[PDB]
């Protein structure tokens, strides 16, 4: 089965960078894949950050957060991983990696997956 | 941005009850849309898939429909296990807008 | 009143035991990678789910395959050089007695001789340094091997350093791995994989340790056929690494003699500076930790009040009575007599010094009539290993007493192998089946 | 339709599914089937994988099922052999489970399927006959 | 290759058409061209970079239509 | 029912009978068809049996007969290469005696099916267009 | 009686400098070079 790990520091000054790891066991990464940081907040609820592609290594941003993160990843190390600079306290919240991706047999549909990890929690604070 | 509401924004109901939820969205997405479970402490649970389509393992009482920017949450049967936060994802377009989400809980006696 | 009918189905995926030929998959040596195909940059491995498989480490048929491989690939590798068939001749022999310790006195021979030239009507008087264990009394010595065969010199070009090789199964046929930790070798795998191929094996020949091996991912792991039977060898492996440093510090000296039309044999010319004996060196507090680790996990098979005793190996040919091994091209035998000496009981920097001794003439496998001639290496040598295993075997073993004696063992090279090939096994397809269906013809 | 990714099912990947989701992907195992001294053996062991794979598709049109991976035949199925329902076979079993549990049936039904092949050839004929 | 042919259903034929209807996009040339004024070389250069797509759909609709002559039956 | 014995038919068991009870024996001799230097030769021998048997299966096919041991054509019989009637052909003759009459007789008869075999294609290529 | 069958409006394209046969043809020389001086005298003794 596959599993999804996160893993970073639970507290952040502001105007920090915040990197954040996320670990996935039982699948490789080298495969056609879609990647998805995440994040809950009482304030917001769930709130897509971006998602890059494993194969093709194209990300997308969410615009609003567009000037202030960054997605990388090491398929040696099976991680992804994310930045986020200017931290404030607004970004506090628990965050989610996810991944997504569909199998086939030709031209046949089989399996639709996705997983979701535990998430990890992040408070932003002097 | 695709702006996706939900609605109710919660309604309580009994176990056996049937439940109707509603997810709109600013322009047309076609058919691309999820519908996810997430209890207290836990992280989302894949329901339906492509609106239409129940995800394997997961109960035959939950079922989806609607196409366009209307699409439609339908329990047939209320189970105890089935009262948490039923969120509406769409990714058509990018970025990915996540609902408000619905809350479903117990009604029961004072 | 079933109403139901027979239904043939064909590419059903159902399996079962097999025996095949696997193929070469890897990435001048002595195994040869030419006649082995190069291995795909990404493999690719497909856990099956609720999949329960049985697996035995003692019938396994990779291990004869491996074994009968290696053995071929070291037959082919010394044809292509010299053979020393003039070598088998009277040798003038005295002492080397110049800059020498108390503990390398009569190892060392200097001799001289007459040999053949380029020219059949000619001859050279020519002189070279021997070794003890290879010149036998006949102040007149020969040859050890003079009366059983003649010896095939060592090829210098190539090397003897072990290199990955991986398994392939062929169409038809599939590989299993188990991924279940603290599987002891035997037994029911709930968690299983299908891959193509498996993980990158070098050949590393070695006795009574296993060196540059694998560890285990939980904890210290005894393995045995039958435990109880004390006629049967128990297979031990670390979760972490040993480091062990050896070391032959002579400065040799190589020198050419031409024997024949394009003949040359390779003799030691002189030794520079001090004389002194090779040796190895391992850690002493990590020895004890790794030997309370091991003691503590036989008290699990063994009672948990019985002491355990560590002592000397029995007896026998120096192979199997010492470590033996190969280091920068120089075949060692060391004297591992200060590591498994202790008893337990339940209830800084130093290191422990193992001396060794060098060879040239090798019978690397268990056969007579097959020597090899080790060329000698130029300047200082030495090298760092990883011990991570042992090969034990228990002595007596009888309800007199309550006390357990393990000594260390080896001999057998498919050992080795079988440490290695343990989690892995080969079937074959039944692509037919047949189920109840409603149509009919 | 942006966000997904497409991977493509191995051998034996549907090892562990039911029989009803396993039956969907009998092409992946079919391909598979067919694709000095070392040599000799390379060459022994794709000659008799060859000679599995005729000899299977002999035993295959024998039945009157040539060129087929799905072929449901007029050979009644007998209770004897299995009293489970569809429904505890196609979608609550495996392949594996389901050849361990008939594996000492297979004999008498290739010969009635072999008979029953015999026989609507004969009927045939002699349909044809007039 | 008798197995790929199998795969279609054109077994044990030589020639053997099916159901999959031609796309324009594929070649816009009509028949009196192809069949009297075109060669097998000519024709595969042309066609060279949509013969995947077409083997895809054939091996679908010979699943599509084994599917529904099996449900058929089973009435 | 008690205290009569069974036994199976052997390889070319039915040399000797007539050729309607040799032609009930097919399956036996058709399963038989498939299955240093010495290795080399047995290698040899086993790939020219593989090629045989599948020249054979190509030439059924190409007649339009495949994956079949027994095969009605539409190709009427000419009284020159026999004049004899089915009684004394099935009942009083064997295949061996029947071979050695209409040695002479094959070829055109294979090259009348292959362009029977060939009209029947047209002309259901040419049914199906409409 | 070597047969040849002159194939009209077929135009290919050739390369004399990389073709294989070339390599083939070599090889087999020096194979049947080698095979060929194998079952007679060795002059090992002429060295004098
Ligand atoms: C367990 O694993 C470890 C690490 O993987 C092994 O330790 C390594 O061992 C190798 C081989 O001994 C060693 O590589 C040698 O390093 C030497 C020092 O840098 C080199 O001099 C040597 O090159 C010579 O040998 C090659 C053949 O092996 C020749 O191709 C090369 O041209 C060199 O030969 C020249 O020099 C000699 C001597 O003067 C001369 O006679 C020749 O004619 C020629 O002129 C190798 O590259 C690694 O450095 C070791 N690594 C570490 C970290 O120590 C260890 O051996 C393994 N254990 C066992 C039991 O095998
Ligand atoms: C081994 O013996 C040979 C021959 O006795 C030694 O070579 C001689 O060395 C001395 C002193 O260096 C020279 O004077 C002689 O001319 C050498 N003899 C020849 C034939 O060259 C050699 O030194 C000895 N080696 C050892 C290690 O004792
Ligand atoms: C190399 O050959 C020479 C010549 O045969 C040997 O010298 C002879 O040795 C024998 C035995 O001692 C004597 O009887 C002869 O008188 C010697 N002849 C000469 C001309 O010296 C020499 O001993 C051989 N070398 C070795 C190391 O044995
Ligand atoms: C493991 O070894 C023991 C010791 O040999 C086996 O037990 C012996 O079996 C033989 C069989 O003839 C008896 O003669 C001995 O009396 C037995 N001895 C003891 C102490 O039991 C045991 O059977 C072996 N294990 C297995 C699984 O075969
Ligand atoms: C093995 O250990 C011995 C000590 O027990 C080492 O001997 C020392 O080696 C160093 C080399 O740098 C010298 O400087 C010391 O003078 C030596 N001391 C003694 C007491 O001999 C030896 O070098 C070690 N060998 C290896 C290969 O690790
Ligand atoms: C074996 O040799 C290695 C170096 O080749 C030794 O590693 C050194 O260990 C000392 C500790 O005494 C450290 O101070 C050095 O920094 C280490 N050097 C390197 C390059 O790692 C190792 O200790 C030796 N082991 C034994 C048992 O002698
Ligand atoms: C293990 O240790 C014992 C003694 O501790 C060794 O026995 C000695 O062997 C040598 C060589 O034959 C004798 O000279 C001694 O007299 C023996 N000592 C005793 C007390 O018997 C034994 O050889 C060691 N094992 C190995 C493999 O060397
Ligand atoms: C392996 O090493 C041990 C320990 O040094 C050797 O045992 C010693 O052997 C000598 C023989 O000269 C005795 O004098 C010592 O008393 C022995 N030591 C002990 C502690 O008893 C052993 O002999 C060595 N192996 C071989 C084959 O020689
Ligand atoms: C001895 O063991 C150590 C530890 O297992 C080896 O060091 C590891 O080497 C691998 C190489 O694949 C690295 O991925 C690890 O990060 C290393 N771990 C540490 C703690 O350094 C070492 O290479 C081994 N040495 C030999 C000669 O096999
Ligand atoms: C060489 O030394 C050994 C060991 O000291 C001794 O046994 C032998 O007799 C010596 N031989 C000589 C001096 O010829
Ligand atoms: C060769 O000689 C050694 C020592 O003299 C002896 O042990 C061995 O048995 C001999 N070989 C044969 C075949 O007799
Ligand atoms: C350990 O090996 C024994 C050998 O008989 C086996 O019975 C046992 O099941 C193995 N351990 C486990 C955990 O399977
Ligand atoms: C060995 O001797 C050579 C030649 O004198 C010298 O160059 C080399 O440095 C010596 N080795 C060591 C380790 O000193
Ligand atoms: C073996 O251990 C004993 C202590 O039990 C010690 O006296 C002796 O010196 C040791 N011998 C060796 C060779 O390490
Ligand atoms: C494995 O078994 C469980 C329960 O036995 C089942 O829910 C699951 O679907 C099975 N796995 C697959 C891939 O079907
Ligand atoms: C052999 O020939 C005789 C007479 O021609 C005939 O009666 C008999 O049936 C033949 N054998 C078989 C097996 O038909």
Known sequence: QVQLHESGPGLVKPSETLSLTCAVSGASISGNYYWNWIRQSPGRGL???????????????????????????????????????????????????????????????????????????????? | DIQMTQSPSSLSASVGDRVTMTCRASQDITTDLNWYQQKPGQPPKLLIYVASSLQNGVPSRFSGSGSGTEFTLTIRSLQPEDFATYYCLQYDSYPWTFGQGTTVDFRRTV | ??????????????????????????????????????????????????????????????????????????????????????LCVTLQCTNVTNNITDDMRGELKNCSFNMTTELRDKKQKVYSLFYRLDVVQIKEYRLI??????????????????????????????????????????????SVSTVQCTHGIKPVVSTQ???????????????????????????????????????????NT?????????????????????????????????????????????????????????????????????????????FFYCNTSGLFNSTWISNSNDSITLPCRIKQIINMWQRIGQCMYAPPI??????????????????????????????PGGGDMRDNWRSELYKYKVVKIEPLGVAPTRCKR | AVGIGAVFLGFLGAAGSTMGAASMTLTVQARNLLSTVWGIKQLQARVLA????????????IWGC?????????????????????????????????????????????????????????????????
């Not at chain 3, 350093?161 to 029911?188: R, V």
């Not at chain 3, 090779?278 to 063994?302: D, I, M, Y």
């Not at chain 4, 000679?51 to 598709?57: A, G, N, T, V």
Request: with cysteine; proline share 4%; aromatic share 10%.
């Open chain 1, 47 to 126: 709130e897509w950050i971006g998602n890059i592609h494993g194969n093709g290594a194209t990300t997308q941003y969410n615009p609003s957060l567009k000037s202030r993160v960054t997605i990388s990843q090491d398929t040696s190390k099976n991680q992804v991983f994310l930045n986020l600079n200017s931290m404030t306290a607004a970004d506090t919240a628990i965050y989610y990696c996810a991944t997504q991706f569909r199998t086939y047999v030709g031209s046949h549909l089989f399996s639709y997956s996705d997983f979701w990890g535990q998430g990890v929690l992040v408070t932003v604070s002097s």
């Open chain 3, 1 to 86: 009143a079933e109403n139901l009918w027979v239904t043939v189905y064909y590419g059903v995926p159902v399996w079962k035991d097999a025996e095949t030929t696997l193929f070469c998959a890897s990435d001048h040596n002595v195994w040869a990678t030419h006649a082995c195909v190069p291995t795909d940059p990404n493999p690719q491995e497909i856990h099956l789910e609720n999949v329960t498989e049985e697996f035995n480490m003692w019938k396994n048929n990779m291990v004869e395959q491996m074994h009968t491989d290696i053995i071929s690939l070291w037959d082919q590798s010394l044809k292509p050089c010299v053979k020393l068939t003039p």
């Open chain 3, 145 to 190: 091997n003079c009366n059983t065969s003649a010896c095939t010199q060592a090829c210098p070009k190539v090397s003897f350093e072990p290199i990955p090789i991986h398994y392939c199964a062929p169409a038809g046929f599939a590989i299993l791995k188990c991924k279940d930790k603290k599987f002891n070798g035997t037994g029911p795998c709930p």
């Open chain 3, 209 to 251: 340790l296993l060196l540059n091996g694998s560890l285990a991912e939980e904890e210290v792991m005894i393995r045995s056929e039958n435990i109880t039977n004390n006629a049967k060898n128990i297979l031990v492996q670390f979760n972490t690494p040993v480091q062990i440093n050896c070391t032959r510090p002579n400065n």
């Open chain 3, 254 to 330: 190589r020198k050419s003699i031409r024997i024949g039309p394009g003949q040359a044999f390779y003799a030691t010319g002189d030794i520079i500076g001090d004389i002194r004996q090779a040796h190895c060196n391992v850690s002493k507090a990590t020895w004890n930790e790794t030997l309370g680790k091991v003691v503590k996990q036989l008290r699990k098979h063994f009672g948990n009040n019985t002491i355990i005793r560590f002592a000397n190996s029995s007896g026998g040919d120096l192979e199997v009575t010492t470590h033996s091994f190969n280091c920068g091209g120089e």
């Open chain 3, 378 to 407: 130029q300047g200082v040598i030495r090298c760092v290993s990883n011990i991570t295993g042992l090969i034990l075997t228990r002595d007596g073993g009888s309800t007199n007493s309550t006390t357990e004696t393990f000594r």
């Open chain 4, 50 to 61: 060859v000679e599995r794979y005729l000899r299977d598709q002999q035993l295959l049109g």
């Open chain 4, 66 to 130: 040539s060129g087929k991976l799905i072929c449901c035949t007029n050979v009644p199925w007998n209770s004897s052999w299995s009293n489970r329902n569809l429904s505890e076979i196609w979608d609550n079993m495996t392949w594996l489970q389901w050849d361990k549990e008939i594996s000492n049936y297979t004999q008498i039904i290739y010969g009635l399927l072999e008979e029953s092949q015999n026989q609507q050839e004969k009927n045939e004929q002699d349909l044809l006959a007039l």
